[PDB]
């Protein structure tokens, strides 16, 4: 209206830098996560806010996010000083050391951009993680990300805000993991007595949701079948996961023995056969490690199943149906199920108009 206005538009570019982290760790708690976080993190928010960027489109790629690589190295660096095994077998080399039992419960960690950088964040609720996001925004720090190490099932994570989401670097390539995100957590109650409970009816629907999302991805005319792990290491074949310092290996066959869209009492609560193990394969690198025997007889751990790691079978034969089995192993997929909407960017001089 005769009042020419000059805008200073922001300019950024994809980049990589060492991020820091923030946690609600306590300097009086002697559990490993709190101990590590304390000496290795910053106090928290406490009222986080983001800068919505109107009518801006940005491209993401969860499968090539250097935020993951950094988090992975941190969780590794955590276990090194935390869970001390009695024996460590790596590369024809054998090591023996003390192995004290220690309290072990994951604490949410926020990864933050340092001075000069920023972190774009997708606000689009149903976002696959690779492609344009037409609803981004800026943040100082990510959200609370628990370093939950495990396979088959993703625990204590983040739920989809709308419908069940599935993500894969290549749905066509059958060797590729299918990270799954639930919009409704399913409780899995564990115990040192060697079993794990899961509501049957709830988990049933949970599979119908996933199935419908998969049938959609591979033609809405294919029958969706779930089957047990096709084989591998104990940490892959069973729902491997940590719970109070002890490593649990739970049979998951009763979970993944369903057939959907096919044609074609009644357990009240699926009970999974479980067992701790002193001798386990390493996720850090290649090798094995042996730990001490369990201590207290009270080992109860209740967690929320918020995600799944599946793999498809396929092949030049499977027509009219698809087969999906539990999977996982690469802990990076675990990270990518949380760090999928983020992206660190370098900030530079503004551009006039």
């Amino acid at each position, epitope marked *: 209206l005769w009042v020419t206005v000059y805008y200073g538009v922001p300019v950024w570019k994809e980049a990589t830098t060492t991020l820091f982290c923030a946690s609600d760790a306590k300097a009086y708690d002697t559990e490993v996560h709190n101990v590590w976080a304390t000496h290795a993190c910053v106090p928290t928010d406490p009222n986080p806010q983001e800068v919505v960027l109107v009518n801006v489109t940005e491209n993401f790629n969860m499968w090539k996010n250097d935020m993951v690589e950094q988090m992975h190295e941190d969780i590794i660096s955590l276990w090194d000083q935390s869970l001390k095994p009695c*024996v460590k077998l790596t590369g024809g080399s*054998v090591i023996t*050391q*003390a192995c004290p039992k220690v309290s072990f419960e994951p604490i949410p960690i926020h990864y933050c951009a340092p001075a000069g950088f920023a972190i774009l964040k997708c606000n689009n609720k149903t976002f696959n993680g690779t492609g344009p996001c037409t609803n981004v925004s800026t943040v100082q720090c990510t959200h609370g990300i628990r370093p939950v190490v495990s396979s088959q099932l993703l625990l204590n994570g983040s739920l989809a805000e709308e419908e069940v989401v599935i993500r894969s670097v290549n749905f066509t390539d059958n060797a590729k993991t299918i990270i799954v995100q639930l919009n409704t957590s399913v409780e899995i109650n564990c115990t040192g007595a060697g079993h794990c409970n899961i509501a049957r009816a709830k988990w049933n629907n949970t599979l119908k949701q996933i199935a419908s999302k998969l049938r959609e991805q591979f033609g809405n005319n294919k029958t969706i079948i779930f089957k047990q792990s096709s084989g591998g290491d104990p940490e892959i074949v069973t729902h491997w996961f940590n719970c109070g310092g002890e490593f649990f290996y739970c049979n998951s066959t009763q979970l993944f023995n369903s057939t959907w869209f096919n044609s074609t009492e009644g357990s009240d609560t699926i009970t999974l056969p479980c067992r701790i*193990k002193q001798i386990i394969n390493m996720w850090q690198k290649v090798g094995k490690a*042996m730990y*001490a*025997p369990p201590i207290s007889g009270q080992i109860r751990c209740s967690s929320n199943i918020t995600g799944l790691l599946l793999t498809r079978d396929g092949g030049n034969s499977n027509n009219e149906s698809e087969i999906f089995r539990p999977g996982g192993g690469d802990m990076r997929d675990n990270w990518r199920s949380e760090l999928y909407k983020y992206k660190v960017v370098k900030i530079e001089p503004l551009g006039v108009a």
Partner: antibody
Amino acid sequence: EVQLVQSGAEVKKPGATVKISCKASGYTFSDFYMYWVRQAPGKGLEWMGLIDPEDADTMYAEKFRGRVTITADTSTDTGYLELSSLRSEDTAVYYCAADPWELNAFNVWGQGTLVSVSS
Amino acid sequence: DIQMTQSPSSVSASVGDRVTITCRASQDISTWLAWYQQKPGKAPKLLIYAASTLQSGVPSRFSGSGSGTDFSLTINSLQPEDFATYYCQQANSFFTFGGGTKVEIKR
């Protein structure tokens, strides 16, 4: 009730490879570790290795690595033990033990298996 | 591997006497230790597990203490059927045995 019944004495020449057994009874075999120990004539006990039958996870002492092998036929509740490249100082009694009560020590033992290796 | 070193190698004592034999790991192994008795011509007998816990059906005059690296088995009123060879043993992962300690009589 619980028991570990090994095999009989065996004679071998240097360089041979012996493989003794240890049929177990009185408990669920595949749910517990099994350990192997040998004892030279009038000398101290000497551990050799262990194994979890379920996943066949094995551990060996340094003095035997890449020369000894422990397995466990889960179907017949039997455990075996192989020793490649036998020498003259391998002449000893071989025990097998277990711990069906999980005290982390050897509670049950075998009667023993004398292995004599000479020219 | 981790070394278990027990001493003395031999010790002579009379009946009623009180005897102490010690063990020592080259690395911390907590309270995961075990003591065995073994008389000539037969298989070893579990005495103590968890360094201090007495095995069932074993005379109360037997007891072991210690934690971490330094341990010790001790017999109060020594008996005629207590003269044998005793062994300690790491029990947390590997199961290395100590050299051995022979408790013979005394005359």
